[PDB]
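Dear Dr. K.,

Following up on our conversation at the group meeting, I've run the structure prediction for Telomerase-binding protein EST1A from Homo sapiens. I'm pasting the input sequence below exactly as I used it, so you can double-check it against your construct before we proceed with anything downstream. Let me know if the numbering doesn't match what you have in your notebook.
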Amino acid sequence: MELEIRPLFLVPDTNGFIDHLASLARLLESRKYILVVPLIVINCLDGLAKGQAGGYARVVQEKARKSIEFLEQRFESRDSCLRALTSRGNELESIAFRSEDITGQNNDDLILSCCLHYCKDKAKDFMIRLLREVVLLTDDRNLRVKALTRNVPVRDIPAFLTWAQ
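The predicted structure tokens came back this morning:
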């Protein structure tokens, strides 16, 4: 089947935040899109922020801190275009106080499940191209593959931001 793609929900991965926070911020500011952050991503960010250190590690840790700060601020403000999704498929409107991992922890699975949550297919819709309103934002080539073979659209963040105007 062929896809008809109309971006609405955007699902980023951890490195999206580390590498591209400012762009994500811009995307959220646009108000055109719903940014849906897998809860595991936030957890991952929490872990990097905390730490368990070399230069690169320290650099990432700060980037991770900045990302959390961003998220917390936006959620606290009740930003209508920002959501978090649990592993179980629950949308969250607050992240105020998170359950932390015992220790620092590979999340394609869950990221993909997030994306797929917003693929709302019904027998009706086929009695035809496949409507898709979700896009995975990633630089990971393997993750990209997995998404594509699952009929989940993908862009890198730079590419997406550019497209978005």
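Two things stood out to me. The chain has one domain: 1-165. The first strand starts at residue 3 and ends at 12.

Best regards,
J.T.
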